[PDB]
Design an enzyme around this catalytic site. Structure first.
Site, PDB file in Angstrom:
ATOM      1  N   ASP A 187       0.870  -1.176   0.000  1.00  0.00           N
ATOM      2  CA  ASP A 187       0.000   0.000   0.000  1.00  0.00           C
ATOM      3  C   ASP A 187       0.912   1.233   0.000  1.00  0.00           C
ATOM      4  O   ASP A 187       0.784   2.094  -0.871  1.00  0.00           O
ATOM      5  CB  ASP A 187      -0.931  -0.008   1.237  1.00  0.00           C
ATOM      6  CG  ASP A 187      -1.718   1.274   1.479  1.00  0.00           C
ATOM      7  OD1 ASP A 187      -2.329   1.790   0.517  1.00  0.00           O
ATOM      8  OD2 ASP A 187      -1.730   1.753   2.632  1.00  0.00           O
ATOM      9  N   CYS A 222      -1.411  -6.210 -14.024  1.00  0.00           N
ATOM     10  CA  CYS A 222      -2.003  -5.725 -12.791  1.00  0.00           C
ATOM     11  C   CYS A 222      -3.492  -5.548 -13.141  1.00  0.00           C
ATOM     12  O   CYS A 222      -4.127  -6.535 -13.526  1.00  0.00           O
ATOM     13  CB  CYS A 222      -1.340  -4.425 -12.315  1.00  0.00           C
ATOM     14  SG  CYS A 222      -1.179  -3.125 -13.579  1.00  0.00           S
ATOM     15  N   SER A 223      -4.032  -4.327 -13.083  1.00  0.00           N
ATOM     16  CA  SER A 223      -5.416  -4.086 -13.477  1.00  0.00           C
ATOM     17  C   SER A 223      -5.419  -3.424 -14.861  1.00  0.00           C
ATOM     18  O   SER A 223      -5.903  -4.021 -15.816  1.00  0.00           O
ATOM     19  CB  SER A 223      -6.142  -3.235 -12.439  1.00  0.00           C
ATOM     20  OG  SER A 223      -7.530  -3.166 -12.717  1.00  0.00           O
ATOM     21  N   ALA A 224      -4.814  -2.230 -14.973  1.00  0.00           N
ATOM     22  CA  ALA A 224      -4.716  -1.444 -16.213  1.00  0.00           C
ATOM     23  C   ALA A 224      -3.558  -1.893 -17.106  1.00  0.00           C
ATOM     24  O   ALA A 224      -3.539  -1.564 -18.294  1.00  0.00           O
ATOM     25  CB  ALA A 224      -4.586   0.036 -15.883  1.00  0.00           C
ATOM     26  N   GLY A 225      -2.615  -2.632 -16.525  1.00  0.00           N
ATOM     27  CA  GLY A 225      -1.430  -3.124 -17.222  1.00  0.00           C
ATOM     28  C   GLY A 225      -0.378  -2.066 -17.481  1.00  0.00           C
ATOM     29  O   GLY A 225       0.356  -2.165 -18.471  1.00  0.00           O
ATOM     30  N   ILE A 226      -0.287  -1.040 -16.596  1.00  0.00           N
ATOM     31  CA  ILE A 226       0.699   0.045 -16.757  1.00  0.00           C
ATOM     32  C   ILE A 226       1.490   0.389 -15.486  1.00  0.00           C
ATOM     33  O   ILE A 226       2.681   0.650 -15.601  1.00  0.00           O
ATOM     34  CB  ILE A 226       0.106   1.353 -17.392  1.00  0.00           C
ATOM     35  CG1 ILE A 226      -1.088   1.935 -16.586  1.00  0.00           C
ATOM     36  CG2 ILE A 226      -0.256   1.142 -18.870  1.00  0.00           C
ATOM     37  CD1 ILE A 226      -1.471   3.412 -16.965  1.00  0.00           C
ATOM     38  N   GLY A 227       0.825   0.465 -14.328  1.00  0.00           N
ATOM     39  CA  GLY A 227       1.445   0.894 -13.071  1.00  0.00           C
ATOM     40  C   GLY A 227       2.436  -0.070 -12.453  1.00  0.00           C
ATOM     41  O   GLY A 227       3.659   0.103 -12.570  1.00  0.00           O
ATOM     42  N   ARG A 228       1.902  -1.071 -11.743  1.00  0.00           N
ATOM     43  CA  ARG A 228       2.679  -2.138 -11.101  1.00  0.00           C
ATOM     44  C   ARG A 228       3.437  -2.903 -12.176  1.00  0.00           C
ATOM     45  O   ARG A 228       4.594  -3.263 -11.968  1.00  0.00           O
ATOM     46  CB  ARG A 228       1.754  -3.098 -10.341  1.00  0.00           C
ATOM     47  CG  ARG A 228       0.824  -2.378  -9.385  1.00  0.00           C
ATOM     48  CD  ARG A 228      -0.088  -3.340  -8.679  1.00  0.00           C
ATOM     49  NE  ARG A 228      -0.984  -2.622  -7.780  1.00  0.00           N
ATOM     50  CZ  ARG A 228      -1.836  -3.208  -6.950  1.00  0.00           C
ATOM     51  NH1 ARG A 228      -1.909  -4.533  -6.886  1.00  0.00           N
ATOM     52  NH2 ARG A 228      -2.607  -2.475  -6.160  1.00  0.00           N
ATOM     53  N   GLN A 266       2.697   4.551 -13.456  1.00  0.00           N
ATOM     54  CA  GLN A 266       1.643   5.571 -13.420  1.00  0.00           C
ATOM     55  C   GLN A 266       1.783   6.640 -12.322  1.00  0.00           C
ATOM     56  O   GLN A 266       1.362   7.777 -12.544  1.00  0.00           O
ATOM     57  CB  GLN A 266       0.261   4.902 -13.340  1.00  0.00           C
ATOM     58  CG  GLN A 266      -0.841   5.712 -14.029  1.00  0.00           C
ATOM     59  CD  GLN A 266      -2.225   5.109 -13.912  1.00  0.00           C
ATOM     60  OE1 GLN A 266      -2.410   3.941 -13.547  1.00  0.00           O
ATOM     61  NE2 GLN A 266      -3.234   5.901 -14.242  1.00  0.00           N
TER      62      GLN A 266
END
Ligand SMILES: C[C@H](N)Cc1cc(O)cc(C(F)(F)F)c1
Length: 288
Positions: A187, A222-228, A266
């Site tokens: 987190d 991840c979810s959007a495929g950019i951040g993590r 991100q």
């Protein structure tokens, strides 16, 4: 420098350690990086709304993964929110950054896995999240999508990841697959949370090398495929850069990622986290 002028900051060990702990410089540097997002008007395809989890997070056309089977001439059938990502030294298609599959894209995801001969999938989550950010696309034991039988052969439980050994079968063709479900994404991206991500990166590097010459693309999501997804890939590229060159260039690595897929890494917290992970790795590597 195809879509924007790339930037660079070659860090030796001392500067790397200090840079990871300078959030004011880290944010100044980060917010100078172009996001290279795709204008949604670039895709004018009936039924496309169902294929994207986020309207503004789209695959850059030049590097998008095209689904060649069963109709390469149909834009909807050929669409997946995924991009080929260059690896260390610009090596083509080392990774595929994609959004976490949704109910309407589970079958499309497996079409991509099969087409690309993907040997490894890296799924990045937290325990608190469970699986509210990504749809459970793998079976409990066995599921078939478009003639491809997906079988979970073994579930290996480790402190920071669940490794699933999967078999993919279609006719006389059988292929292996390693699915790493990372559960220690933090987190608060504090340096004490850096060791599990580093361990995952190192484990995946070892698995990737064991595939032998010209390893097929590794899917990261991840979810959007950019951040993590961006953090994991940037970390993996920089680990190689550190071992080979004795320096790290997170700024240039981030620019290279953004050229391939808009928005890779991100947040600035994610950007600083890559620095914390790389600073730790340099310290570990200094002992050998
Ligand atoms: C040289 C080849 N691209 C294989 C490879 C080696 C490595 O050390 C790390 C990766 C990974 F993609 F996982 F980061 C891949």
């Amino acid at each position: 420098n195809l879509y924007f002028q790339s930037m660079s900051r070659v860090l030796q060990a001392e500067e790397l350690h200090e840079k990871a702990l300078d959030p004011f410089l880290l944010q100044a540097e980060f917010f100078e990086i172009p996001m290279n997002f795709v204008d949604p008007k670039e895709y004018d395809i009936p039924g496309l709304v169902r294929k994207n989890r986020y309207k503004t997070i789209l695959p850059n056309p030049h590097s998008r993964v095209c689904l060649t089977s069963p109709d390469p001439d149909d834009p909807l059938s050929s669409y997946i929110n995924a991009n080929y990502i260059r690896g260390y030294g610009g090596e083509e298609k080392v990774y595929i950054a994609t959004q976490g599959p949704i109910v309407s894209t589970v079958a499309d995801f497996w079409r991509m896995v099969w087409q690309e001969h993907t040997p490894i999938i890296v799924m990045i989550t937290n325990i608190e999240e469970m699986n509210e950010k990504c749809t459970e696309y793998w079976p409990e034991e066995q599921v078939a999508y478009d003639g491809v039988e997906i079988t979970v052969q073994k579930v290996i439980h480790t402190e920071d990841y669940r490794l699933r050994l999967i078999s993919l079968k279609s006719g006389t063709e059988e292929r292996g697959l390693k699915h790493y479900w990372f559960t220690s994404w933090p987190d608060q991206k504090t340096p004490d949370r850096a060791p599990p991500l580093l361990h995952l990166v190192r484990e995946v590097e070892e698995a990737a090398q064991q595939e032998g010459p010209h390893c097929a693309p590794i899917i990261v999501h991840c979810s959007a495929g950019i951040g993590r997804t961006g953090c994991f890939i940037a970390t993996s590229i920089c680990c190689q850069q550190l071992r080979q060159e004795g320096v790290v260039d997170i700024l240039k690595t981030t620019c290279q990622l953004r050229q391939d897929r808009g928005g890779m890494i991100q947040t600035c917290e994610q950007y600083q986290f890559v620095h914390h992970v790389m600073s730790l790795y340099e310290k570990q590597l200094s002992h050998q």
